[PDB]
Amino acid sequence: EPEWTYPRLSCPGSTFQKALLISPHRFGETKGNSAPLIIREPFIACGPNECKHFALTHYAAQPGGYYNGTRGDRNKLRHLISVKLGKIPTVENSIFHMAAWSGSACHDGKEWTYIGVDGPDNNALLKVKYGEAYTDTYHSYANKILRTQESACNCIGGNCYLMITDGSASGVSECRFLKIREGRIIKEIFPTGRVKHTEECTCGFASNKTIECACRDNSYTAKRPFVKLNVETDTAEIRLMCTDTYLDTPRPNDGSITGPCESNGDKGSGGIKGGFVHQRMESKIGRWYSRTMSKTERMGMGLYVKYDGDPWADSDALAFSGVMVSMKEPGWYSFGFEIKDKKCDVPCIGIEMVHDGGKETWHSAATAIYCLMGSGQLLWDTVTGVDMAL
Amino acid sequence: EPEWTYPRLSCPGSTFQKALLISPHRFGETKGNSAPLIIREPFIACGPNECKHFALTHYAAQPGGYYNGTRGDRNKLRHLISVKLGKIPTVENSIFHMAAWSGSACHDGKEWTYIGVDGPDNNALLKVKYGEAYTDTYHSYANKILRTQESACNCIGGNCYLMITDGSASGVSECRFLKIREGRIIKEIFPTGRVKHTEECTCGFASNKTIECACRDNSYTAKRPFVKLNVETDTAEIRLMCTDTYLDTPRPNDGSITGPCESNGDKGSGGIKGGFVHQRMESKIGRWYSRTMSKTERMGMGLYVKYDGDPWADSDALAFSGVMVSMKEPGWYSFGFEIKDKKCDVPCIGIEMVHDGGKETWHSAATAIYCLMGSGQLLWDTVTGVDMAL
Amino acid sequence: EPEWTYPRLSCPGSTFQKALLISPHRFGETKGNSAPLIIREPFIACGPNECKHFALTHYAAQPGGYYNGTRGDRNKLRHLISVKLGKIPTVENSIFHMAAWSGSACHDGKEWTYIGVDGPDNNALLKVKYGEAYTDTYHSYANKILRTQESACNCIGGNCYLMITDGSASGVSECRFLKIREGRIIKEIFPTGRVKHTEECTCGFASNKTIECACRDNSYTAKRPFVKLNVETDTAEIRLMCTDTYLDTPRPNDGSITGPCESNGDKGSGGIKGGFVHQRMESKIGRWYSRTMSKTERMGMGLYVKYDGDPWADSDALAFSGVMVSMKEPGWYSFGFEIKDKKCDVPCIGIEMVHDGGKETWHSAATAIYCLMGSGQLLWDTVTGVDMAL
Amino acid sequence: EPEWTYPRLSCPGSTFQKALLISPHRFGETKGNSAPLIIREPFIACGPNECKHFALTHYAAQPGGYYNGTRGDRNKLRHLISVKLGKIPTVENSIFHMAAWSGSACHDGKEWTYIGVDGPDNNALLKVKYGEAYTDTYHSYANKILRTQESACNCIGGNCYLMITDGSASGVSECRFLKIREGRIIKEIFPTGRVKHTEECTCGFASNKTIECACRDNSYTAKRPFVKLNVETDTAEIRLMCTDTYLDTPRPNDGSITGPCESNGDKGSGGIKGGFVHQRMESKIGRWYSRTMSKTERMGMGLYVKYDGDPWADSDALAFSGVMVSMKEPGWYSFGFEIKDKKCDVPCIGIEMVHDGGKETWHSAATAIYCLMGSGQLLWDTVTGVDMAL
Ligand SMILES: *[C@@H]1O[C@H](CO)[C@@H](O[C@@H]2O[C@H](CO)[C@@H](O[C@@H]3O[C@H](CO[C@H]4O[C@H](CO)[C@@H](O)[C@H](O)[C@@H]4O)[C@@H](O)[C@H](O[C@H]4O[C@H](CO)[C@@H](O)[C@H](O)[C@@H]4O)[C@@H]3O)[C@H](O)[C@H]2NC(C)=O)[C@H](O)[C@H]1NC(C)=O
Ligand SMILES: *[C@@H]1O[C@H](CO)[C@@H](O[C@@H]2O[C@H](CO)[C@@H](O[C@@H]3O[C@H](CO[C@H]4O[C@H](CO)[C@@H](O)[C@H](O)[C@@H]4O)[C@@H](O)[C@H](O[C@H]4O[C@H](CO)[C@@H](O)[C@H](O)[C@@H]4O)[C@@H]3O)[C@H](O)[C@H]2NC(C)=O)[C@H](O)[C@H]1NC(C)=O
Ligand SMILES: *C1O[C@H](CO)[C@@H](O[C@@H]2O[C@H](CO)[C@@H](O[C@@H]3O[C@H](CO)[C@@H](O)[C@H](O)[C@@H]3O)[C@H](O)[C@H]2NC(C)=O)[C@H](O)[C@H]1NC(C)=O
Ligand SMILES: *C1O[C@H](CO)[C@@H](O[C@@H]2O[C@H](CO)[C@@H](O[C@@H]3O[C@H](CO)[C@@H](O)[C@H](O)[C@@H]3O)[C@H](O)[C@H]2NC(C)=O)[C@H](O)[C@H]1NC(C)=O
Ligand SMILES: CCC(CC)O[C@@H]1C=C(C(=O)O)C[C@H](N)[C@H]1NC(C)=O
Ligand SMILES: CCC(CC)O[C@@H]1C=C(C(=O)O)C[C@H](N)[C@H]1NC(C)=O
Ligand SMILES: CCC(CC)O[C@@H]1C=C(C(=O)O)C[C@H](N)[C@H]1NC(C)=O
Ligand SMILES: CCC(CC)O[C@@H]1C=C(C(=O)O)C[C@H](N)[C@H]1NC(C)=O
Ligand SMILES: *[C@@H]1O[C@H](CO)[C@@H](O)[C@H](O)[C@H]1NC(C)=O
Ligand SMILES: *[C@@H]1O[C@H](CO)[C@@H](O)[C@H](O)[C@H]1NC(C)=O
Ligand SMILES: *[C@H]1O[C@H](CO)[C@@H](O)[C@H](O)[C@H]1NC(C)=O
Ligand SMILES: *[C@H]1O[C@H](CO)[C@@H](O)[C@H](O)[C@H]1NC(C)=O
Ligand SMILES: [Ca+2]
Ligand SMILES: [Ca+2]
Ligand SMILES: [Ca+2]
Ligand SMILES: [Ca+2]
């Protein structure tokens, strides 16, 4: 019989390495006979036995004749799909969980919870599934596009925690946290602090008592807002990441934002979902982050790390760990997830690599995975190997 | 070991919402590489661990060369098929249960029961299959196209109840109920009351004591015949629904059929199978129905609910719960099924959205899913997104 | 924990009915995107939990460019493949058990045994697999094409019995029986009686003590040789089926072979594998057989039945049960198999329907299934629905 | 719960026979609708319930547009993949374990261990994965293409032994052995003796005490270096095989290398990985090897055996056990693996049959399987049946 699940100490290791590429569109050419789903916003969640690869499909394959509109975001056809990690997400392999143009998922130890937001922009609806059953919803509270993590949610003792948000992308977007248990919302958590704009949060456990998320401010700053959730007291505070190594895109030169830690600075309009995962140690806490190689475009992806301290107060640059994606390749969304080993947890970062040929062709993505493994320096970058002309 | 299942209290919730679209022909294009089966009359039936998506195929794929005939109903090629709900029903994903040009299925908590009618129009044969084995048959009794539900049948305590009917579709078709147990028919129940013409009943549990069916008079009325089946005494009775919200298609204007409740009215000729599903609470029962948005065409699909009362006597209009399919998309057969959550049941409605381009091109169908979830109003509607020309 | 398996009493029923068609080539057209394996000699075997559909593929799909040679029999590419019954045997769905141009399989209650013969004609080799492991072989003893049942073998108390044979197709072919236990040959059984030519035997249990097979004489008679295996004493006798209803193809007019029961008669050169399954009752034994509608070509397929008596001595015509395949459709190999219901066994007959366009096109087959179900007369025939020009 | 596995006595048997052909490119034609992966360096590794078929893909299918590069070895796209043995390794059937341009895997009785080396030629990285989790890494030690077995590694009592090597392939490559446990490297074993150049060892258990490896000197000899690894003391020693039946390709004429056993000889430059597998009896051990039928080209594959004796000292020619691939078909890499039967182990040899049409067309491979089964001589040989022009 299955127990609830808890964050365990991390596995030993001092560096990340290239783990695995999932590039479906290597098989999307017209010469071929394969049918990979057009997707975006991939993310991964692992339970005690499998890891699932999730995405939002446009309900189209390549090749096909429904490309037109695949470079949009919300519509009545977007679905949350998954396959077992390491399987190519195709028409036959994928499972379609629910209609949703925004999503999340997480395993509590007994069951999968699936999260999908759909509906009209002025009144969207967060839906929840526990296994195969629809169990609860949540309503827009700002009437300006309710949306969620695009990342794994996080469960502890059967309590699953989920960031949601609502409000103008180019203005105020106050996020809330949901406390979900066996598919049903049992508490809403309103953060305090710097709440102006928080979205597309990437959250993991820093401890058995705290969740941390690095988030996106699409409006005011290239600093990432940084949430701290206290799971023992069901309360949350958000302050900007003080680090000179600004993690959003677009962004100014590192350390060029003058003033106190909460200062917004410039080139802070727009943003990108960023990767963040915890290395939990006995007397240490490892914080691993990812950001675009370009300060302006979605190209390349870098790995950064900082042990200990307070991300709210420390202005120190993050340590640069290595190049995961070269600047000559697309570097879009990235996310954190952990694989459950037998006795310990393995932290990993995934990378969405979008094939963008403009609005006059199909628009989709591959997923690069990096994971904490062994000692040394990160050794090799990743390429999609896709030529969109085929 | 497993035990027999019984209807449970429904899960908490106040409105339906868009769950899931299964739209195989989104990958049905010449430009592509997939092979979705040409099907019609879909329905869903869920068990303690799996929900299954059934349909009647024509034993052809799109694209393919065997379109001719796919706009017909009965032939030697038709087979009851299924995929796990959420999977695209393609040549490879599908499983072929039996030859059938009319079907049903249901889980008793121990095993799947599958039901398929095939054979000549003047001597059809209902076949029962329990798991992998074929176990019993029922004979035509009117020699006018013996036929069954096209929706999930209903199992309580190992006993599965099923509507069957036989007769001219422009005249009399007195239906019967079969009591099946572990694949074998143990009692025929002959309903009393308004028996002139019943078919394509959508049935579900109103309690541990009563099964209710909303049906189709293809001959005499636009009101749906409404079966109450007492499961304790194995007796059944039919009267027409009194509600001014007439549920068949075609139909006249709401509340325009004058006279006592049993009055047939104008626009009786013709019909369509309608969604019906139960919401079982503490000491009240909600009844959820679906009808096409057009009075005469198979376009659109609206949701309606009515808590309590006797459906044989309540002239009251049903409450309009929302638009599931717009008047600009096809709305064909609809059906009710329930999903099993950990401790309670989730009431759902499925809509068949047929792609119809005439007898000179392929003729298949998508399936839209709406389920009780959360509170509020029903928000978004469903399109199939299919271009029948691609 | 699993027990060994034994023949149980049959399920009640007095007639066969059309159960299920598996016609992969409905999806083989060039307009399509599917890839069904080119196969022949299909057969089915069921264990306590699933039923597997077996065949010998030419290691080619349709469409493709390896048709040339698919109208042959033995080569270094022929394999024994299977899928779960009701699944279309395609390149992806099928599993490849072993190289073999002749085969058999059966479940003992704990495990699958697979049988495949390959090698050169003058020295072929019978191979055995127990689950995934190759466990034993058997050698040609006549150097003239060692070959086997093309049908399910039969297990009792963990002992699986298998017909094999060797020798000229147009001359003498003395069959032997193998006693196999957990993948290894533990006894060879040499029949006595009329041993001149016995091949492609279709065997089932007539009792907990006897196996009966109806076989093919390709050389001397259109009567089917009829084996009786005694499982309590590991001994076997073969005599010709005395019945006027000659079951082989080609064949003379019924009852036209004058003389004693063992008389060969004419039109007895050549032959066809014929279907045969037992209806085991308390005080009765049902023997169900199938034979071509044509007396000369492989067209149509008929169902016959006789209760009780001695098939060695009785000259009475078999009772005609109905037309399974019309004479306007191909009727090639047929076979018997039983599905295990919960408390009882269900007898069924399968029919190989070859698409034969000559040697200048592909050459493959679909499988029609009929099964004992309910009372009355067999109601409907089967068609492949395939146009080989597509 | 499961327990650790140990080598068991082999099953009874005296000769190998043709088991199974996996030839994906039989469905690789333009005329068709399949998508087999372009792979090379296959190998098999079996566990207590499943046997897995591994390969290194180039992340492309046939037909497809990414042929260019598929005749190379190392690039960022290469991934270790697998299907259950008997399944066609296509885009949909496959699972992508990790990025790797050199690989291995093995089961300890509790879990799969997967091994993949990727990275720059001058700083490769071996990655260890235990089930779903990445668990450890090993670094280049010569900065000359760290690389591993390309065959199953070897687990006894939870300890998995693996050969790795690093060095110029036209010079020195002193190999090492890694002792892995539950994904983690717990000891490096540095072999003594003839260490000049070892690589691509094919390893297997000779007893509960000793692992034996037949390897490849790509530089100095056509004799195979032969590792004896004592598993009790974790020490290893290498000397060359003395047998006149030299096993590398290219090679000179048998018994033409004159001198003591350690003598290198002519035609040392170049090499190929060879099949090697153990047959463990009461108190004797058979050693089965494979070598290409041509002295200089990668054509054909023959089987050889030698019961007992010391392979470091036995000048005796090995007994020729048969032709598996004719001199008219490709014979590339070969490898040994064992299948687990109920109470004993089944020794097997796998052959890589590469389809080579030059650097201007696709470059992939089939896999032939031979296993110990029954007695006699080895009968039939294997073709792949592929036309590289289709
Ligand atoms: C239609 O009819 C069926 C059959 O009667 C009803 O199903 C039963 O529903 C009741 C609840 O109404 C169930 O009783 C409960 O069982 C709980 C344990 O879960 C399992 O229990 C056994 C094994 O322990 C299993 O065999 C079974 O399948 C259950 O899944 C108990 O924990 C509960 O007891 C607690 O609750 C109350 C106080 O709140 C008290 O009884 C106790 O003091 C205790 O605190 C509870 O008794 C019963 O198990 C169900 N049986 C079956 C076969 O399903 C349907 O509810 C009914 N539908 C209606 C009425 O709409
Ligand atoms: C390499 O090393 C391993 C570990 O020592 C050996 O594996 C053992 O092999 C022996 C046989 O040589 C096994 O002993 C036998 O166990 C049988 C039962 O099967 C299971 O037993 C237990 C549970 O009962 C399980 O834990 C285990 O995994 C087995 O699968 C017994 O029935 C046998 O006993 C009978 O046989 C003889 C007489 O013939 C007597 O011992 C008894 O009187 C009795 O009649 C038998 O003892 C042992 O279980 C194996 N262990 C493991 C962990 O696998 C390998 O054989 C060895 N390889 C070599 C030597 O080549
Ligand atoms: C916070 O989450 C739980 C809080 O209890 C921690 O998990 C638990 O960890 C303990 C020990 O780490 C486990 O207890 C036992 O440990 C002994 C060794 O002393 C061992 O022999 C037993 O077999 C047993 O495992 C306990 O089972 C485990 N529970 C679960 C559900 O995992 C967790 O480590 C904490 N997270 C941290 C510290 O980051
Ligand atoms: C020949 O095969 C076996 C020979 O024993 C028969 O199967 C066995 O049948 C008996 C009864 O049919 C089963 O015993 C028990 O029956 C009682 C009822 O009296 C029931 O309450 C028990 O639960 C139990 O089932 C026995 O279990 C069963 N064994 C197996 C392995 O199936 C079989 O019926 C014979 N075949 C014939 C007669 O055709
Ligand atoms: C809706 C606001 C938000 C910020 C602009 O848009 C996101 C940015 C997009 C992006 O930056 O690539 C992709 C996301 N799919 C989108 N989210 C939704 C719900 O549409
Ligand atoms: C045969 C009577 C019945 C009522 C008109 O026909 C149904 C009409 C249906 C319809 O109105 O679309 C299609 C159904 N598939 C068909 N059922 C059968 C068994 O043919
Ligand atoms: C080899 C003798 C036998 C009788 C002519 O041939 C069978 C007849 C063929 C047939 O009658 O259709 C098909 C069988 N695949 C074949 N068996 C083998 C092993 O090739
Ligand atoms: C790099 C040294 C080694 C020996 C020549 O190369 C091998 C030659 C092999 C060969 O001879 O065909 C192909 C192997 N895939 C390759 N291995 C790697 C890691 O590239
Ligand atoms: C459809 O089939 C009928 C016969 O069944 C045939 O007469 C008709 O021409 C076919 N239609 C087309 C468009 O080919
Ligand atoms: C293969 O790729 C190289 C560059 O990587 C390119 O120069 C060459 O032309 C390509 N070959 C073909 C046949 O296109
Ligand atoms: C698709 O783009 C076309 C241009 O090809 C444009 O006319 C239209 O806005 C879009 N239509 C749909 C259905 O997406
Ligand atoms: C296939 O048939 C061709 C004719 O197209 C003939 O030349 C030859 O005998 C056959 N070849 C193979 C490889 O089967
Ligand atoms: Ca920003
Ligand atoms: Ca009507
Ligand atoms: Ca004959
Ligand atoms: Ca050499």
UniProtKB/TrEMBL annotation, chains A, B, C, D:
Catalytic activity from the UniProt record: Hydrolysis of alpha-(2->3)-, alpha-(2->6)-, alpha-(2->8)- glycosidic linkages of terminal sialic acid residues in oligosaccharides, glycoproteins, glycolipids, colominic acid and synthetic substrates
Its biological purpose: Catalyzes the removal of terminal sialic acid residues from viral and cellular glycoconjugates.
Signal peptide: none
Family (UniProt): Belongs to the glycosyl hydrolase 34 family.
Known partners and oligomeric status: Homotetramer.
Cofactor annotation: Ca(2+)
GO biological process assignments: carbohydrate metabolic process
Region of the whole protein represented: 77 to 466 of 466
Organism expressing this protein natively: Influenza B virus
Post-translation changes: N-glycosylated.
EC number: 3.2.1.18
Membrane topology of this protein: Single-pass type II membrane protein
Locations listed in the record: Host membrane; Virion membrane; Host apical cell membrane
Disulfide pattern: 11-344, 46-51, 106-153, 155-160, 201-215, 203-213, 242-261, 348-371
UniProt KW keywords: Calcium, Disulfide bond, Glycoprotein, Glycosidase, Host cell membrane, Host membrane, Hydrolase, Membrane, Metal-binding, Signal-anchor, Transmembrane, Transmembrane helix, Virion
Protein name: Neuraminidase
GO molecular function: exo-alpha-sialidase activity; metal ion binding
